[PDB]
């Protein structure tokens, strides 16, 4: 959607100007393993990074 054009304001400006994106990024960076059903590493692996 950053690549996507909206038909003005670009969609990246919509994303950064939206107040929910900062909560999205906090929830991603503070996600860890809240369920804790199985023993898991706190790191997210290379692909998510």
């Amino acid at each position: 959607m950053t690549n996507m054009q909206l038909n003005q304001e670009t969609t990246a400006h919509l994303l950064v100007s939206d107040p929910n994106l900062i909560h999205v990024l906090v929830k991603f960076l503070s996600g860890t393993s809240p369920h804790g059903t199985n023993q898991h590493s706190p790191q997210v692996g290379p692909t998510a990074t």
Binding site: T32, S33, P34, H35, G36
Partner: protein, 57 residues
């Protein structure tokens, strides 16, 4: 073990006088841990101490 003896001594010392305050304190502890942004939901904290506290409750 130290937390278990501390809670046991609280129970022994307040069984005669006022066990309802100790029971309400234990319930408030479970409530604060069990809510959102808590130790129970996020998985942080010791598992052993929380399990022993649950068994004591």
């Amino acid at each position: 073990q130290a937390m278990q003896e501390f809670l046991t001594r609280l129970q022994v010392h307040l069984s005669s006088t006022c066990p309802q305050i100790f029971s309400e304190l234990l319930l408030k502890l479970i409530h604060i841990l069990s809510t959102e942004r808590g130790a129970f939901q996020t998985g942080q904290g010791p598992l052993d101490a929380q399990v022993k506290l649950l068994e004591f409750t």
